[PDB]
Amino acid sequence: GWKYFKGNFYYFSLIPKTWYSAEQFCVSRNSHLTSVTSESEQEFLYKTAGGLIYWIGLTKAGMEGDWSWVDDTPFNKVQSVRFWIPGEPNNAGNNEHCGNIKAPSLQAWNDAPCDKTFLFICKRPYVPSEPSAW
């Protein structure tokens, strides 16, 4: 049930999990909760989400609480300001350290507490089966 888009496969879960349990599910399937690194990818993801809330690989790292991608893609702060819902991230009750796709729109992301359970989206690069490149 993996959907293909620009060199990556994506898994849209049918069962809700916490942020970390979802990530462990993704890792068990040789993947990670999805990063988002372009306008077209965000569009593909929110359009496919169809108005439902999915955890993505948005989470906090460093002492600052800078946002990051659990798949280790460097987070581009400047290029990602267009992807949050206006007023987000707002850190409601000082306890929101994970991120989901919420609004069916380009401005779509929200921070929520990591312990809430939602559907989730895993992402994995297409890697062709090919011999030793050494």
Ligand SMILES: [Ca+2]
């Ligand atoms: Ca929020």
